């Protein structure tokens, strides 16, 4: 109702930064981002893995199939996979050996729901190594794969321009 | 906030990046850094530069080895 | 008092942190173990960095009739 929320710097105390303006916390945005790993950890990291792998997947094509090193390809193995089914791979363990900055070793299974979560102190960590696996495992099958309905999609194209 | 670099100690649990650089450039300063004795040191420069002569022959070898099958002689 | 409109529906209000969408499409365990071997992750990565990276580079460099540098 007010001048802009009940007017506030942060959630509350103004001695943390964030300076909650728009571009920060307008219900216009903060909802365009929480089926995913923004505020709350849906299901485990398991599945988010491939919508992440895949979406980021069929990117990196015209970047390296239309800006490729000697470009506009007449090779049936480009306008798609070619190599870049390398990036996802050079970085699908650019990750795994960051989940070695995560260990914390468990197995609860709580992607099913119980009592309206919080995951509470959900900030900081509180996602152990046996989580960051099933994500960067979702990554490979999201990266490699997400590279082919790029490729596989013929190409009808416009522009332009 | 863990414990790492296996010789120094002040360096070892320094939370920044100095942690790194300063690791990779105290290595060769044996005389006085944690691990050392006038007995250690000496020998710890001795089987060091026996790690020398050693690397001078993997140089010279290849010098004579990109030459013998191509590289006119 | 007409513009005192009793806040034309309060809302409740604050929706929530509560509850402005259900969740994630039911597509899941339609990958259960499907693609496992990062879902058998129980000791790996050393395997996929000789394997995958000896076949992004073994045949990837070699070639039977140049099309040269």
């Amino acid at each position: 109702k007010p001048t802009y929320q009940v007017i506030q710097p942060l959630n509350g105390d103004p001695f943390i930064g964030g300076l909650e303006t728009p571009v920060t916390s307008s219900p216009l945005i903060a909802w365009y981002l929480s089926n995913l790993p923004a505020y709350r950890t849906a299901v485990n990291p398991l599945l988010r893995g491939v919508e992440v792998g895949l979406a980021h997947g069929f990117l990196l094509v015209g970047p390296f199939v239309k800006a490729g090193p000697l470009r506009n390809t007449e090779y049936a193995g480009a306008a798609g996979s070619l190599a870049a089914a390398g990036l996802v791979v050079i970085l699908s363990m650019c990750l795994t050996m960051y989940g070695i900055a995560s260990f914390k070793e468990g197995e609860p299974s709580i992607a099913p729901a119980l009592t309206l979560t919080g995951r509470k102190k959900q900030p900081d960590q509180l996602q152990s190594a046996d989580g960051w696996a099933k994500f960067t495992g979702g990554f490979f099958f999201g990266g490699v794969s997400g590279v082919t309905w790029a490729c596989f999609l013929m190409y009808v194209l416009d522009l332009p321009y | 906030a863990l414990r790492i670099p296996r010789f120094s100690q002040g360096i070892a649990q320094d939370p920044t990046t100095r942690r790194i650089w300063f690791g990779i450039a105290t290595a060769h300063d044996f005389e006085s850094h944690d691990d050392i004795t006038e007995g250690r040191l000496y020998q710890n420069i001795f089987a060091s530069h026996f790690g020398q002569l050693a690397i001078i022959f993997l140089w010279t070898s290849g010098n004579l080895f990109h030459v013998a099958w191509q590289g006119n002689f | 008092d007409l513009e005192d409109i009793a806040n034309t529906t309060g809302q409740w209000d604050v929706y929530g942190s509560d509850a402005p969408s259900p969740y994630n499409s039911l597509q899941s365990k339609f990958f259960e173990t499907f693609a496992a071997p990062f879902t058998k992750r129980g000791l790996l990565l050393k395997f996929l960095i000789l394997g995958g990276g000896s076949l992004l580079t073994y045949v990837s460099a070699n070639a039977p009739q140049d099309v040269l540098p």
Binding site: - | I4 | T57, N62, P64
Partner: peptide, 30 residues
């Protein structure tokens, strides 16, 4: 077969690096 001695620049200038940039991220942790 004809004309094929190209593996000792990636296994070195490429893959050997992969190893140690990975591996030696032992400096961070192991």
């Amino acid at each position: 077969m004809i004309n094929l001695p190209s593996l000792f620049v990636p296994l070195v200038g490429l893959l050997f690096p992969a190893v140690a940039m990975a591996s030696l991220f032992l400096h961070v942790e192991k």
